[PDB]
Amino acid sequence: DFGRKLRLLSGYLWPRGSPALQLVVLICLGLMGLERALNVLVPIFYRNIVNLLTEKATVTSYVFLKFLQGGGTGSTGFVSNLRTFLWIRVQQFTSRRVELLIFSHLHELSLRWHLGRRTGEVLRIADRGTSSVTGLLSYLVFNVIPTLADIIIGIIYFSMFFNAWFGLIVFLCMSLYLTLTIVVTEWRTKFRRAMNTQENATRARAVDSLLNFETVKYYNAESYEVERYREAIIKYQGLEWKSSASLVLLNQTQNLVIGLGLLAGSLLCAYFVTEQKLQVGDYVLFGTYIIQLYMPLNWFGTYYRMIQTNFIDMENMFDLLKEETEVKDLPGAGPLRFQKGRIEFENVHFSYADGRETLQDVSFTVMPGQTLALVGPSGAGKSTILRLLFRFYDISSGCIRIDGQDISQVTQASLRSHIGVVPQDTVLFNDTIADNIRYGRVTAGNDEVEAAAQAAGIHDAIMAFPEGYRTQVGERGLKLSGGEKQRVAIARTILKAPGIILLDEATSALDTSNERAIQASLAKVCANRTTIVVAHRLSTVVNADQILVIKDGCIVERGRHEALLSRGGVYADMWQLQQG
Amino acid sequence: DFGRKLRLLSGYLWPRGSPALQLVVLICLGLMGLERALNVLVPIFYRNIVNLLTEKATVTSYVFLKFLQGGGTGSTGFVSNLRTFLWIRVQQFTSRRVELLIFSHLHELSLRWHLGRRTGEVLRIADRGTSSVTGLLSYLVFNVIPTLADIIIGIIYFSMFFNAWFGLIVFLCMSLYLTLTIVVTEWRTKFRRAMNTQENATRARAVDSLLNFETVKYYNAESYEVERYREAIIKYQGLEWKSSASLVLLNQTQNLVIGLGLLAGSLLCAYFVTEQKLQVGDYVLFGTYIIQLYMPLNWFGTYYRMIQTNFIDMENMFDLLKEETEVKDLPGAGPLRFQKGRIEFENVHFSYADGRETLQDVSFTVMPGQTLALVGPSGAGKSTILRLLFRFYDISSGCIRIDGQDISQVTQASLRSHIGVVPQDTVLFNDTIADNIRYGRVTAGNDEVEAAAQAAGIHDAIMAFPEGYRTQVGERGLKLSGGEKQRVAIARTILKAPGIILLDEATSALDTSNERAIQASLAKVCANRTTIVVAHRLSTVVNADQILVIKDGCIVERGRHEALLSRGGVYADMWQLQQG
């Protein structure tokens, strides 16, 4: 409902709790009230000028009128520019507020809603929504309210000038122009759609005839395809002629009824002045005043398709404002009493769909200073289990606790502030390398950045790179090798400094110097730490405290490397798979 | 040079040899001469109206003036619409002529110039060139010549009205407005470029922060990345404020000097009317006339960047009009005396670059009704040799003849009208299947289409397909399997009906029913025909008249399948390769 629209937008014109911009909004509405006042009052002073020309038929008072002509007609576009100039800062604050609100609200967690959507449409609808808000409030307060107020105040000015049929015929003019502009823009839009479809068809046929140059040369369609492409060009250009001729008939019947309204009004004023029943000589006022009233009407009428496009851009954003979470912050959300790092699972379950069991009834209690290593099947059940330690997903039942307390009663940020997960990939934003390291924890100075780079050993890569300690990396910057990308990731987690460690070891192994180097840095970050590792490699699983393979939603075997080799479970099969 | 530009465009306004559209061009220039005549003459009649209002201070002659007011002011935009309405058909013919000219000229053969260019930019520069021609001639004859003619005829009308300093100060106004609009559009363009670069940077940082949702959630950058993204938004929005404020200062100093010019002109006319040294009461004429002169000047000034963009769109198209060929049609280009189909090579060479020898000194004479089968190395030398039988490329030396006469002295179309080459791929245009078959030879009726479909055997696929004999195929239509795509290709070549056959057999083999079916259709098209085959298969090479392997620019062995197996050349090595 438009009542909800107007209430929400009158709220959207309210910046904040600071007294320095509400005053500017008051300046904006003050000049908005001033503009129509001058826009109706200064042609009366033009009428005074020509009337005093007739009555002096004086130069000093005529100059005291001409100064009003100068400072009045040099003020219409000038006050419009001042309005739009402060409207700029209005748009600045409103766009900041709505963009940061929707950018916070698209950073909630609903991952099944996330992953099906690409990033481009998700942020394109956000940009369309903020430019929707901008264009919508600016046009509805700049070219809808003031032009209707101008028409109303023109008819009421005539009602205090002379109450006659003149206001009725001018009202007939403006209403007729409005109605015809709306209905022939509705005539325009189907021609625009058909012309777009035909130009897409002809350009597609053109480029797809150009794609196979060798068969176009193999056959003698050299003079045939130009004829068929000219046929498609004619078939599009006829509809092009129809659309442009529809524009012609729009402007033609528009200017025709404008000329008829000028003719009727000017003849009735001409009859009045030759019959002298009113003040005479005023014909220039009613002459230019119809044009001056009309000049914003096509400025409105070119935006009937635009306001409905703003509506469909803002309504989906309004739906996107307030939707949902997947993990719900329950009340009583408190801190995470990081005593020892002891994580227990008790007959737990999970679903990302209906009856969806990638995990079903596993249970353990991993101790401080000890290491679980996990192999799974050819599936994302391992990463899913890793994500539900993180509470990236939800549980249907069971009991997941960390250090005695359940993971679901608490704040998410105070849960994931004591957690360091190594990802198999590594994003590189288009930025520099000390900011890329401080992405681990942004409260660092550069001393801890350099200390963590010397802890990992990747500072020598920063020596090999140009910019000192600020090497610009990313998509357009300075690129990297994959093990070094994982070295930047482990340097980020080293700077973040948790106690709970969760490695996502890549199945893509590297050179044995790179392999033993990443295992040695994993040792240097994992020594006397509560460590949980998913892996598919050898050196990780031949030393850990317990090795688990979790396939088809269950633990399929339990025990150390010697236990699996002495009982000969599925580790024998995957032993043949790692061999070859 | 602009002299070449004006001469070429005055030629570009000349359609053809038909007397029905040059008359319409005469109508266009007649209304163009009429428009400025009425546009300067009707405010003089407004001046007559208000003057006769003062001198009657009559209604019948005043109505005989008011009818001129009606039919004159209801004619300015009306004659502009009629002009543009016939301008539409002018653009239709000129766009048809230039698009078909450039589409014929981009269908010449320079393949090294072809293949490095993608199709999209090649046709995008063509569309930009035709809209360049459209916008360039329409604006240079509609908003450059007429507004300069309007300013000139206004000053000369004043020179026949009263020769004074009034023309000089109004000329100062129009020239000053023109100069400031040009220089602040030059101020505008750098702000637009910087604003575009900043919005690209902020949206790239936004989407690349959104790309790795899981590491954004893994770290507590949930409240940090909104701050850094707000910092980038502020850094872009400041330049946005600067660009929009530059627009404000453009329109502000514009309307300021417009108000100053109105003030100076109106005061000098006010001094004149209060001193009565001219005809009096005429102040409305000089009042509205400055606005009416000015109204096309910003309509020009918004297109200074546009005309130079039209220039850079048309100049490259002018370079593209007339460039070159790779195979040159020598004079004496005659028919191809298709006696028997006997093709001879005599110490021939080829280069697509400097010192580029993929082929060097091969020589043979292939007979009628007999078959050469060709294997090469892992390279496109085979297809290159196939293309120089076609004369798709050029030769540096040697002697290539077909049926006694050299291939280079003749017309290309009469050479390639007796040639059927099977391509390894098959293009499917977005069209129907009988047109896809008639792509082989467009002079066919549907009887030969159905006869060729029953010759190949693919008419049963048309039975399996919905539309009878007009099944819509291509990129958006009804798709196909690869062997059936080659069946449509061989049906096209069957309809084309040459004598010279050149098969491009795929290395991708199929099922033995599909394999022996395509070999049987190749037999049904190749029986008692002059046949040349490139292949890598078995059934083609175990029966042909001679088998040649051509590697490193030379024939590496010669002989039949039994000859290569009894001498044991490289066919032994490739025998091990086809085995495994």
Side-chain angles (χ1 to χ4, degrees), chain A residues 3 11 15 17-326 331-335 341 353 355 368-369 373 376-377 379-381 398 404 413 420 423 434 440 444-445 451-453 455-457 461 464 466 468 474 477 482-483 489 491 497-499 506 509 517 520 523 527 535 544 553 559 563 568-569 572 580, chain B residues 3 11 15 17-326 331-335 341 353 355 368-369 373 376-377 379-381 398 404 413 420 423 434 440 444-445 451-453 455-457 461 464 466 468 474 477 482-483 489 491 497-499 506 509 517 520 523 527 535 544 553 559 563 568-569 572 580:
Chain A
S18 176
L21 264 302
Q22 294 161 349
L23 273 43
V24 187
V25 172
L26 296 202
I27 304 163
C28 290
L29 59 97
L31 311 170
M32 186 45 90
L34 165 60
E35 174 214 4
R36 306 268 79 103
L38 56 88
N39 202 219
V40 163
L41 264 292
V42 307
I44 317 164
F45 305 140
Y46 200 102
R47 177 211 48 88
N48 270 341
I49 283 171
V50 289
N51 259 323
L52 270 54
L53 201 149
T54 68
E55 303 321 301
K56 79 161 296 299
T58 51
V59 57
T60 74
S61 48
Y62 191 74
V63 156
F64 261 109
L65 266 293
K66 280 302 290 319
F67 173 68
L68 316 175
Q69 186 58 242
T73 326
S75 178
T76 318
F78 149 77
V79 79
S80 183
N81 297 359
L82 291 181
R83 273 197 326 280
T84 51
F85 172 59
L86 280 309
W87 270 98
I88 284 155
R89 193 53 57 88
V90 174
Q91 301 308 322
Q92 289 279 273
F93 204 99
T94 45
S95 158
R96 271 188 286 162
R97 154 183 163 161
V98 66
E99 266 288 329
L100 267 298
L101 178 67
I102 64 179
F103 193 78
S104 168
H105 274 114
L106 63 89
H107 270 307
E108 277 145 343
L109 183 46
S110 282
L111 205 72
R112 316 273 85 81
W113 160 91
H114 261 293
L115 291 171
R117 290 182 171 187
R118 299 285 161 83
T119 296
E121 45 260 40
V122 163
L123 177 63
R124 182 188 273 247
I125 192 176
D127 303 343
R128 268 184 277 110
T130 182
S131 285
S132 185
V133 160
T134 291
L136 177 141
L137 67 96
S138 47
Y139 295 156
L140 263 74
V141 178
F142 214 82
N143 318 310
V144 170
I145 285 172
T147 185
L148 202 50
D150 210 320
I151 295 314
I152 280 183
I153 206 170
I155 300 177
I156 296 313
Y157 158 70
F158 270 76
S159 197
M160 60 85 69
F161 201 37
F162 65 101
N163 311 263
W165 299 271
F166 282 64
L168 187 63
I169 52 183
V170 179
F171 167 59
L172 169 143
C173 303
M174 323 314 306
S175 45
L176 207 169
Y177 308 149
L178 206 61
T179 48
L180 72 96
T181 41
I182 290 159
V183 301
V184 191
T185 41
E186 272 312 303
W187 258 96
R188 268 169 156 199
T189 181
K190 49 192 195 59
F191 277 165
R192 294 164 184 275
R193 276 180 180 194
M195 168 168 128
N196 286 12
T197 302
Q198 286 323 292
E199 72 200 359
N200 292 0
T202 65
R203 290 179 288 103
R205 295 330 178 278
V207 305
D208 291 324
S209 43
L210 295 199
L211 272 189
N212 196 340
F213 289 116
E214 50 90 9
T215 59
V216 168
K217 263 70 181 186
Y218 276 1
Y219 299 104
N220 290 115
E222 174 78 16
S223 171
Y224 151 76
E225 203 69 28
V226 296
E227 290 168 317
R228 213 197 39 87
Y229 152 75
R230 191 265 310 279
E231 159 63 42
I233 282 303
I234 282 183
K235 194 187 60 183
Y236 149 75
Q237 273 178 339
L239 275 81
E240 151 72 34
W241 170 47
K242 288 207 305 173
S243 156
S244 292
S246 68
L247 266 70
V248 178
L249 307 181
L250 169 65
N251 275 314
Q252 193 45 66
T253 199
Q254 203 190 14
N255 281 183
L256 184 152
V257 65
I258 293 152
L260 276 191
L262 284 175
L263 178 50
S266 58
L267 278 178
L268 265 296
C269 306
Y271 212 72
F272 260 57
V273 183
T274 190
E275 283 179 342
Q276 289 89 27
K277 76 197 87 171
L278 85 179
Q279 179 45 260
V280 287
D282 304 340
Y283 159 72
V284 51
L285 162 74
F286 322 113
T288 183
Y289 190 68
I290 303 286
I291 281 296
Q292 218 280 152
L293 289 176
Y294 185 62
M295 275 307 114
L297 274 187
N298 52 4
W299 295 3
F300 156 73
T302 183
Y303 293 115
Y304 172 61
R305 194 257 311 271
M306 273 311 294
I307 49 180
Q308 303 315 302
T309 313
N310 295 344
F311 281 158
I312 70 153
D313 283 325
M314 66 104 79
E315 178 256 343
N316 319 122
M317 172 257 289
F318 283 175
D319 275 1
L320 189 61
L321 288 176
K322 49 166 180 292
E323 265 149 347
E324 71 168 43
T325 55
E326 260 190 27
Chain B
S18 176
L21 264 302
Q22 294 161 349
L23 273 43
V24 187
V25 172
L26 296 202
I27 304 163
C28 290
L29 59 97
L31 311 170
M32 186 45 90
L34 165 60
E35 174 214 4
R36 306 268 79 103
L38 56 88
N39 202 219
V40 163
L41 264 292
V42 307
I44 317 164
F45 305 140
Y46 200 102
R47 177 211 48 88
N48 270 341
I49 283 171
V50 289
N51 259 323
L52 270 54
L53 201 149
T54 68
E55 303 321 301
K56 79 161 296 299
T58 51
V59 57
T60 74
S61 48
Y62 191 74
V63 156
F64 261 109
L65 266 293
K66 280 302 290 319
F67 173 68
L68 316 175
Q69 186 58 242
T73 326
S75 178
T76 318
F78 149 77
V79 79
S80 183
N81 297 359
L82 291 181
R83 273 197 326 280
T84 51
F85 172 59
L86 280 309
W87 270 98
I88 284 155
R89 193 53 57 88
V90 174
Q91 301 307 322
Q92 289 279 273
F93 204 99
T94 45
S95 158
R96 271 188 286 162
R97 154 183 163 161
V98 66
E99 266 288 329
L100 267 298
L101 178 67
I102 64 179
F103 193 78
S104 168
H105 274 114
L106 63 89
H107 270 307
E108 277 145 343
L109 183 46
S110 282
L111 205 72
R112 316 273 85 81
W113 160 91
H114 261 293
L115 291 171
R117 290 182 171 186
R118 299 285 161 83
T119 296
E121 45 260 40
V122 163
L123 177 63
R124 182 188 273 247
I125 192 176
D127 303 343
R128 268 184 277 110
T130 182
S131 285
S132 185
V133 160
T134 291
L136 177 141
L137 67 96
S138 47
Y139 295 156
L140 263 74
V141 178
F142 214 82
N143 318 310
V144 170
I145 285 172
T147 185
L148 202 50
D150 210 320
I151 295 314
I152 280 183
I153 206 171
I155 300 177
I156 296 313
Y157 158 70
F158 270 76
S159 197
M160 60 85 69
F161 201 37
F162 65 101
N163 311 263
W165 299 271
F166 282 64
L168 186 63
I169 52 183
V170 179
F171 167 59
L172 169 143
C173 303
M174 323 314 306
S175 45
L176 207 169
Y177 308 149
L178 206 61
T179 48
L180 72 96
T181 41
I182 290 159
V183 301
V184 191
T185 41
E186 272 312 303
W187 258 96
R188 268 169 156 199
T189 181
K190 49 192 195 59
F191 276 165
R192 294 164 184 275
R193 276 180 180 194
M195 168 168 128
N196 286 12
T197 302
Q198 286 323 292
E199 72 200 359
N200 292 0
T202 65
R203 290 179 288 103
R205 295 330 178 278
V207 305
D208 291 324
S209 43
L210 295 199
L211 272 189
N212 196 340
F213 289 116
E214 50 90 9
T215 59
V216 168
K217 263 70 181 186
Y218 276 1
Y219 299 104
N220 290 115
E222 174 78 16
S223 171
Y224 151 76
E225 203 69 28
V226 296
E227 290 168 317
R228 214 197 39 87
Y229 152 75
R230 191 265 310 279
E231 159 63 42
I233 282 303
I234 282 183
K235 194 187 60 183
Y236 149 75
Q237 273 178 339
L239 275 81
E240 151 72 34
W241 170 47
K242 288 207 305 173
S243 156
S244 292
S246 68
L247 266 70
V248 178
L249 307 181
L250 169 65
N251 275 314
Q252 193 45 66
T253 199
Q254 203 190 14
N255 281 3
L256 184 152
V257 65
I258 293 152
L260 276 191
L262 284 175
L263 178 50
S266 58
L267 278 178
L268 265 296
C269 306
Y271 212 72
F272 260 57
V273 183
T274 190
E275 283 179 342
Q276 289 89 27
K277 76 197 87 171
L278 85 179
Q279 179 45 260
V280 287
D282 304 340
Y283 158 72
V284 51
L285 162 74
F286 322 113
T288 183
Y289 190 68
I290 303 286
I291 281 296
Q292 218 280 152
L293 289 176
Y294 185 61
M295 275 307 114
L297 274 187
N298 52 4
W299 295 3
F300 156 73
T302 183
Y303 294 115
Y304 172 61
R305 194 257 311 271
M306 273 311 294
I307 49 180
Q308 303 315 302
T309 313
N310 295 344
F311 281 158
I312 70 153
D313 283 325
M314 66 104 79
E315 178 256 343
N316 319 122
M317 172 257 289
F318 282 175
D319 275 1
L320 189 61
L321 288 176
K322 49 166 180 292
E323 265 149 347
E324 71 168 43
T325 55
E326 260 190 27

